[PDB]
Enzyme design. Structure first.
Site, mmCIF file in Angstrom:
data_model
loop_
_atom_site.group_PDB
_atom_site.id
_atom_site.type_symbol
_atom_site.label_atom_id
_atom_site.label_comp_id
_atom_site.label_asym_id
_atom_site.label_seq_id
_atom_site.Cartn_x
_atom_site.Cartn_y
_atom_site.Cartn_z
ATOM 1 N N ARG C 39 30.633 -77.347 -41.827
ATOM 2 C CA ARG C 39 29.442 -77.454 -40.713
ATOM 3 C C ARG C 39 29.627 -76.439 -39.538
ATOM 4 O O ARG C 39 28.636 -76.481 -38.798
ATOM 5 C CB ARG C 39 29.548 -79.062 -40.230
ATOM 6 C CG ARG C 39 30.884 -79.447 -39.509
ATOM 7 C CD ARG C 39 30.735 -81.110 -39.230
ATOM 8 N NE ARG C 39 32.265 -81.582 -39.261
ATOM 9 C CZ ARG C 39 32.197 -82.905 -39.301
ATOM 10 N NH1 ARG C 39 31.304 -83.728 -39.794
ATOM 11 N NH2 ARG C 39 33.516 -83.669 -39.116
ATOM 12 N N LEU C 64 27.912 -82.011 -44.946
ATOM 13 C CA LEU C 64 28.258 -82.538 -45.930
ATOM 14 C C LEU C 64 27.715 -84.034 -46.255
ATOM 15 O O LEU C 64 27.668 -84.487 -47.299
ATOM 16 C CB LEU C 64 29.737 -82.692 -46.502
ATOM 17 C CG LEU C 64 30.161 -81.099 -46.680
ATOM 18 C CD1 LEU C 64 31.723 -81.220 -46.721
ATOM 19 C CD2 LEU C 64 29.846 -80.539 -47.956
ATOM 20 N N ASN C 94 41.373 -88.086 -41.480
ATOM 21 C CA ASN C 94 41.948 -89.284 -41.394
ATOM 22 C C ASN C 94 41.432 -90.116 -40.146
ATOM 23 O O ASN C 94 41.846 -89.673 -38.970
ATOM 24 C CB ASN C 94 43.408 -89.271 -41.701
ATOM 25 C CG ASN C 94 44.479 -90.560 -41.840
ATOM 26 O OD1 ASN C 94 43.802 -91.640 -41.521
ATOM 27 N ND2 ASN C 94 45.573 -90.441 -42.115
ATOM 28 N N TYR C 153 39.589 -94.416 -44.878
ATOM 29 C CA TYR C 153 40.320 -93.135 -45.660
ATOM 30 C C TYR C 153 41.059 -93.352 -46.752
ATOM 31 O O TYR C 153 40.835 -92.561 -47.735
ATOM 32 C CB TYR C 153 41.319 -92.352 -44.217
ATOM 33 C CG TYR C 153 41.881 -91.054 -44.823
ATOM 34 C CD1 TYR C 153 41.146 -89.956 -44.833
ATOM 35 C CD2 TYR C 153 43.495 -91.007 -44.859
ATOM 36 C CE1 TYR C 153 42.062 -88.694 -45.127
ATOM 37 C CE2 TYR C 153 43.652 -89.795 -45.419
ATOM 38 C CZ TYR C 153 43.141 -88.652 -45.512
ATOM 39 O OH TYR C 153 43.739 -87.385 -45.735
ATOM 40 N N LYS C 157 40.496 -91.874 -50.363
ATOM 41 C CA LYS C 157 41.168 -90.961 -51.109
ATOM 42 C C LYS C 157 41.582 -91.513 -52.627
ATOM 43 O O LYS C 157 41.853 -90.638 -53.499
ATOM 44 C CB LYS C 157 42.565 -90.736 -50.210
ATOM 45 C CG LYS C 157 42.333 -90.020 -48.925
ATOM 46 C CD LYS C 157 42.094 -88.582 -49.164
ATOM 47 C CE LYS C 157 40.681 -88.179 -48.493
ATOM 48 N NZ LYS C 157 40.576 -86.636 -48.814
ATOM 49 N N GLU C 185 52.055 -84.329 -46.180
ATOM 50 C CA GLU C 185 52.141 -83.746 -44.643
ATOM 51 C C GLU C 185 51.856 -82.194 -44.655
ATOM 52 O O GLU C 185 52.654 -81.533 -45.071
ATOM 53 C CB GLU C 185 53.553 -84.093 -44.044
ATOM 54 C CG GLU C 185 54.093 -85.541 -44.255
ATOM 55 C CD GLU C 185 52.980 -86.660 -44.209
ATOM 56 O OE1 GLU C 185 52.508 -86.724 -42.919
ATOM 57 O OE2 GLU C 185 52.824 -87.504 -44.946
ATOM 58 N N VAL C 186 50.767 -81.908 -44.052
ATOM 59 C CA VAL C 186 50.547 -80.463 -44.142
ATOM 60 C C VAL C 186 50.097 -79.953 -42.519
ATOM 61 O O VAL C 186 49.129 -80.650 -42.078
ATOM 62 C CB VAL C 186 49.540 -79.931 -44.891
ATOM 63 C CG1 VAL C 186 49.136 -78.378 -44.826
ATOM 64 C CG2 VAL C 186 49.777 -80.493 -46.219
HETATM 65 N N1 LIG Z 1 46.760 -82.163 -43.198
HETATM 66 C C1 LIG Z 1 47.361 -82.864 -44.196
HETATM 67 O O1 LIG Z 1 48.553 -83.307 -43.779
HETATM 68 C C2 LIG Z 1 46.733 -83.567 -45.423
HETATM 69 C C3 LIG Z 1 47.401 -84.584 -45.977
HETATM 70 C C4 LIG Z 1 46.985 -85.123 -47.089
HETATM 71 C C5 LIG Z 1 45.607 -84.857 -47.505
HETATM 72 N N2 LIG Z 1 44.889 -83.951 -46.703
HETATM 73 C C6 LIG Z 1 43.555 -83.689 -47.185
HETATM 74 O O2 LIG Z 1 43.262 -82.429 -47.270
HETATM 75 C C7 LIG Z 1 41.986 -82.071 -46.665
HETATM 76 C C8 LIG Z 1 41.713 -81.199 -45.790
HETATM 77 O O3 LIG Z 1 42.362 -81.607 -44.631
HETATM 78 P P1 LIG Z 1 42.837 -80.516 -43.623
HETATM 79 O O4 LIG Z 1 44.224 -80.902 -43.061
HETATM 80 O O5 LIG Z 1 42.927 -78.984 -44.184
HETATM 81 O O6 LIG Z 1 41.692 -80.312 -42.550
HETATM 82 P P2 LIG Z 1 41.015 -79.597 -41.577
HETATM 83 O O7 LIG Z 1 41.886 -78.348 -41.006
HETATM 84 O O8 LIG Z 1 40.239 -80.457 -40.430
HETATM 85 O O9 LIG Z 1 39.779 -78.647 -42.475
HETATM 86 C C9 LIG Z 1 38.686 -79.472 -42.827
HETATM 87 C C10 LIG Z 1 37.440 -78.842 -42.635
HETATM 88 O O10 LIG Z 1 36.531 -79.324 -43.200
HETATM 89 C C11 LIG Z 1 35.297 -79.732 -42.079
HETATM 90 N N3 LIG Z 1 34.525 -80.837 -42.289
HETATM 91 C C12 LIG Z 1 34.987 -82.033 -42.276
HETATM 92 N N4 LIG Z 1 34.051 -82.745 -42.515
HETATM 93 C C13 LIG Z 1 32.917 -82.240 -42.932
HETATM 94 C C14 LIG Z 1 31.681 -82.325 -43.074
HETATM 95 N N5 LIG Z 1 31.211 -83.948 -43.061
HETATM 96 N N6 LIG Z 1 30.640 -81.450 -43.347
HETATM 97 C C15 LIG Z 1 31.249 -80.108 -43.160
HETATM 98 N N7 LIG Z 1 32.183 -79.799 -42.925
HETATM 99 C C16 LIG Z 1 33.414 -80.614 -42.756
HETATM 100 C C17 LIG Z 1 36.105 -79.413 -40.927
HETATM 101 O O11 LIG Z 1 35.308 -79.173 -39.827
HETATM 102 P P3 LIG Z 1 35.301 -79.799 -38.461
HETATM 103 O O12 LIG Z 1 36.711 -80.436 -38.196
HETATM 104 O O13 LIG Z 1 35.187 -78.391 -37.506
HETATM 105 O O14 LIG Z 1 34.282 -80.590 -37.907
HETATM 106 C C18 LIG Z 1 37.174 -78.540 -41.041
HETATM 107 O O15 LIG Z 1 36.638 -77.098 -41.057
HETATM 108 C C19 LIG Z 1 41.377 -83.535 -46.611
HETATM 109 O O16 LIG Z 1 40.449 -83.977 -47.737
HETATM 110 C C20 LIG Z 1 42.345 -84.200 -46.365
HETATM 111 O O17 LIG Z 1 42.035 -85.707 -46.562
HETATM 112 C C21 LIG Z 1 45.337 -83.516 -45.680
HETATM 113 C C1 LIG Z 2 46.426 -86.446 -41.026
HETATM 114 C C2 LIG Z 2 47.220 -86.889 -42.225
HETATM 115 O O1 LIG Z 2 46.392 -87.264 -43.162
HETATM 116 C C3 LIG Z 2 47.074 -87.249 -44.418
HETATM 117 O O2 LIG Z 2 46.177 -87.772 -45.504
HETATM 118 C C4 LIG Z 2 48.244 -88.310 -44.152
HETATM 119 O O3 LIG Z 2 49.004 -87.976 -45.529
HETATM 120 C C5 LIG Z 2 49.086 -87.563 -43.162
HETATM 121 O O4 LIG Z 2 50.199 -88.406 -42.887
HETATM 122 C C6 LIG Z 2 48.503 -87.544 -41.928
HETATM 123 O O5 LIG Z 2 48.009 -88.818 -41.400
#
Ligand SMILES: NC(=O)c1ccc[n+]([C@@H]2O[C@H](COP(=O)([O-])OP(=O)(O)OC[C@H]3O[C@@H](n4cnc5c(N)ncnc54)[C@H](OP(=O)(O)O)[C@@H]3O)[C@@H](O)[C@H]2O)c1
Ligand SMILES: C[C@@H]1O[C@H](O)[C@@H](O)[C@H](O)[C@@H]1O
Ligand SMILES: NC(=O)c1ccc[n+]([C@@H]2O[C@H](COP(=O)([O-])OP(=O)(O)OC[C@H]3O[C@@H](n4cnc5c(N)ncnc54)[C@H](OP(=O)(O)O)[C@@H]3O)[C@@H](O)[C@H]2O)c1
Ligand SMILES: NC(=O)c1ccc[n+]([C@@H]2O[C@H](COP(=O)([O-])OP(=O)(O)OC[C@H]3O[C@@H](n4cnc5c(N)ncnc54)[C@H](OP(=O)(O)O)[C@@H]3O)[C@@H](O)[C@H]2O)c1
Ligand SMILES: NC(=O)c1ccc[n+]([C@@H]2O[C@H](COP(=O)([O-])OP(=O)(O)OC[C@H]3O[C@@H](n4cnc5c(N)ncnc54)[C@H](OP(=O)(O)O)[C@@H]3O)[C@@H](O)[C@H]2O)c1
Ligand SMILES: C[C@@H]1O[C@H](O)[C@@H](O)[C@H](O)[C@@H]1O
Ligand SMILES: C[C@@H]1O[C@H](O)[C@@H](O)[C@H](O)[C@@H]1O
Ligand SMILES: C[C@@H]1O[C@H](O)[C@@H](O)[C@H](O)[C@@H]1O
Ligand SMILES: [Cl-]
Ligand SMILES: [Cl-]
Ligand SMILES: [Cl-]
Ligand SMILES: [Cl-]
Ligand SMILES: [Mg+2]
Ligand SMILES: [Mg+2]
Lengths: 258, 258, 258, 258
Positions: C39, C64, C94, C153, C157, C185-186
């Protein structure tokens, strides 16, 4: 809830201590007939309590690592009671045989844990078929979580889970159900002796208890036993092959919770 | 086995048909007080049987997709009985909303299945905390096996499993246990209506039954119910977060067996 | 290892930040053509790097949660490239919608997370069938571990894991593989924003990192990306329906380890 | 995708036939140095192909059930190459040792399958620590699905999964990753020999193939190999303790699908 286990004959290996003792006691309470297979004579008070609930309950001295002893004890059980309705494979020991230990020690751990579960099933199954009975195997969360320094036990415990699925398959057409219970932390004489191997057992025990999600406390032998006895009963008449975790959330809940 | 559920108040959503009906009946047999939340009035014979076991059992008309109705019905239950000891989230429908259906239909499926499990927990939890009560969520093996042409239901059923782990975490310090039961094939009015959507329902039913490993027969509502009620009881006092498969080996045993 | 992804067109939702960005960058490195649906405008340096690896890489502005936007962006991608070989459902947040939040907040979390994974598959599947393409869904360990205060969330998930199995079943005869990656955790912009909601973010962060078994450090976006891209490739030609945990042992190894 | 396995020394047990052979060949293609431990001489054309890709590839005659042979072959590999970067425990045989077979046969199956995985890790781990290397254990879906008439093998295969989690825990601080690959049906010399024990091998084969969800065909050795080699590589640098199913959906997708 009537479990319909009255007068059903169930062998419980290691059935007079810890988890196994609680399983025997619950079986007796339900008027099943527990038959304790164990190498050391049960304490008198335990025997009194068992007999008060079910006077036909008994104990046979068996070193489970001796195949002939397993064979003869199953035979004696059939001679005495005329039938066998359940087998609880429960005897075990977390013996700390790690990656450094070598082949002979690893195999000795398999003998202390895994191989008698097979031996007992081998001798019990013909009789269980006759009564459409059931098997419960007591495994350990270490089968899926690991622990460190305990390859022998972990291997055994994982094999026990695989055997649960395999025997469920093998015996399905005979109506014999096979399930497992997976404890994590349960205060028993085994746990007392295991924790005593650490530098600071009191602190270590407290550390571990604090990590159990539900109540920050160990699971009780009665908690393991009640799930195990439910699984032996016709109340679980379509449950087979399953691994039931009774662990306060230890295995599956977020490691990060305090 | 005493379950110690006497006079415990348990809401059962969809509690007068199929699996839910069997859960209500078993609760009543154990002298618990089932409170049926459902949109259509129960049949008279079912109500008679419930009242014979537990005269305080009752029914509240609730369309679960209406948040205000859930809210008011939980409030009415507390007003009537003064406490709440359990929640069984059970109402559901395998509605065949596939990949081709589109957003609106997918969301409607979430409303029919997933969203009321959350709504009910939302309204029930403050009361469950007060009694250190328990929740059981009824999911489906399709959450882990898939089925085809049923994204809406599968998504809902998988979300219900995730919510079981999440609520177990969230409520652990309050002593509220949260578990799930996963059926595969159970003959109920829902199954009758679902199978009727096929070209040849009699042949299809026989085909499916032949694939259930234990007995080549469907699981009964009573089999699901007895595991569910065990999970509501203090006999499962260290079981939380768990997914209990009651399925005749459907999910976990070798697909190749005949 | 040749992944044979050269000139394969892959939509990556949220494909310019965190995990999604790393997925797009790895796709470009392998000569695939990533198409970022997001977006907000991607960072200039990111797009520069992407274009240096694959000059045909592109970005389409998409919210989305707007079904028509998903529809039109997929149509535009097909108009531009004539084909679609992969879909990575990755955008998520989350959002901390717990048991106390209520229906409206819970459904909003579903919209932010679950529902667009379905919408995207709905619109992409006709095109993936034509190319025998593949889907990867990015879920979260919270689907199986819980976390607390995040029902919306977690539900989403978990639904994404179930949908992975369901779509794998639905699409098997078309040779379209569907798999999921489960991070724990990333460090990403989302993690920075999430951890900032805590009273002591720096300390909370260190506390969480110390609990990751392998190396006591967070997983990197590149680590998630390399598994996700492997799963998109014909090197994984018999892998479908699977959930790959890339988490340093977070989900499965003994919670007690330090 | 660069796997960064160039000049990395990897022992592959049973590494010149079926799955193991495909693993060795892929390692050679990636410029790693596979070291085949096997009891019979590899086929000339296999060795020719291996040497064309990696001229330093070698073969050591080893009967894996002889502990001293494992010991001496690891020592020789270190003497030759000065380092060890990976261990693939792969040799195995589905030997059909069922419930009726007895103790001696069951333990022999453990020797043929489980015990050398331990022995090999025991001897290799000191060297893998020095290189922050990796282990891959090849298990079998029978560890989780059962099969019937194969307790010895099932037990072994399940123990190998548990050992994967245990070694991942034990070795984490040394940066040594340990993972498992779980195949279901793969056409190899073992499968040919196994299927030949059935009354109608050609028909049995077709019957089994029809039950594989993705494509109604067996998985290839190369498909198993590519996941196994990915897991050996730093592209999987935060993956440890994991069990990767490469099975065309055999284990996890609805048993009812055709
Ligand atoms: N980071 C972690 O520790 C972790 C752990 C487990 C699972 N995950 C999963 O990994 C995935 C990616 O996470 P991430 O940490 O890489 O997040 P991120 O850095 O916030 O990247 C997500 C991107 O998707 C965009 N986005 C979110 N909602 C949207 C929508 N409705 N329409 C269009 N764009 C949208 C965000 O845009 P904006 O933020 O600018 O709005 C952002 O650019 C997620 O599905 C999350 O649940 C992450
Ligand atoms: C933002 C991140 O979302 C993920 O899904 C979780 O597994 C992590 O612990 C953290 O909360
Ligand atoms: N306690 C836990 O936290 C825990 C957790 C997970 C799994 N488990 C499993 O639960 C089971 C029971 O454990 P527990 O803690 O209740 O142990 P326990 O208190 O030591 O009881 C086991 C009994 O079995 C006997 N026994 C052991 N090996 C035997 C053999 N070869 N032949 C005959 N008798 C034998 C012991 O006798 P002696 O000690 O007198 O020799 C003892 O009476 C084991 O399989 C264990 O792996 C326990
Ligand atoms: N039967 C199976 O094989 C099977 C297998 C796996 C999982 N399950 C799960 O088991 C649960 C119960 O299934 P079942 O087969 O026992 O179904 P059932 O016989 O149809 O019983 C469900 C009851 O819930 C009611 N209900 C449904 N939606 C409602 C709503 N929005 N508001 C109020 N009442 C509602 C139904 O009423 P009306 O029908 O009259 O409208 C019905 O009385 C479901 O969650 C299902 O997903 C069933
Ligand atoms: N093929 C499948 O469908 C399948 C499915 C699931 C899991 N698996 C697993 O995959 C692995 C490999 O199976 P595969 O089908 O590729 O078998 P394979 O073609 O028979 O290859 C195994 C090789 O290992 C050798 N070997 C066996 N035992 C040995 C020992 N004690 N010492 C030295 N060498 C030994 C064999 O030699 P000889 O035969 O000449 O004696 C053979 O060369 C096994 O662990 C098996 O459990 C296979
Ligand atoms: C003695 C006990 O063995 C069990 O299997 C383990 O789960 C406990 O942590 C403890 O080590
Ligand atoms: C109506 C039933 O829904 C359940 O969830 C499924 O598991 C059954 O196969 C059937 O489709
Ligand atoms: C020989 C093969 O062994 C493997 O482990 C099994 O998964 C196959 O079904 C087959 O029996
Ligand atoms: Cl160790
Ligand atoms: Cl579909
Ligand atoms: Cl919450
Ligand atoms: Cl057998
Ligand atoms: Mg004493
Ligand atoms: Mg009617």
């Amino acid at each position: 809830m009537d479990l319909n286990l009255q007068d059903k004959v169930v062998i419980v290996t290691g059935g007079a201590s810890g988890i196994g003792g609680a399983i025997s006691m619950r079986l007796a309470e339900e008027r099943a007939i527990p038959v304790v297979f164990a190498r050391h004579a049960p304490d008198g008070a335990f025997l009194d309590a068992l007999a008060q609930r079910q006077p036909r309950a008994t104990y046979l001295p068996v070193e489970l690592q001796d195949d002939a002893q397993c064979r003869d004890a199953v035979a004696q059980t059939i001679a005495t009671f005329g039938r066998l309705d359940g087998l609880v494979n429960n005897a075990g020991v977390n013996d700390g045989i790690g990656l450094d230990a070598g082949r002979d020690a690893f195999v000795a751990s398999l003998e202390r844990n895994l191989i008698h579960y097979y031996a007992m099933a081998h001798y019990c199954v013909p009789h269980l078929k006759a009564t459409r009975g059931a098997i419960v195997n007591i495994s350990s969360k270490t089968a899926v979580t690991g622990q460190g320094n305990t390859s022998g036990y972990c291997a055994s415990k994982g094999a026990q889970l695989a055997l649960t699925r395999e025997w469920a398959v093998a015996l399905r057409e005979h109506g014999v159900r096979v399930n497992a219970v997976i404890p994590a932390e349960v205060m028993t004489p085994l746990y007392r002796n295991w924790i005593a191997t650490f530098e600071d057992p009191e602190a270590k025990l407290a550390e571990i208890a604090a990590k159990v999600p539900l109540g920050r406390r160990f699971t009780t032998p009665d908690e393991i036993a009640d799930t195990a006895v439910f699984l032996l009963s016709p109340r679980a008449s379509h449950t087979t092959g399953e691994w039931l975790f009774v662990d306060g959330g230890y295995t599956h809940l977020d490691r990060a919770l305090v």
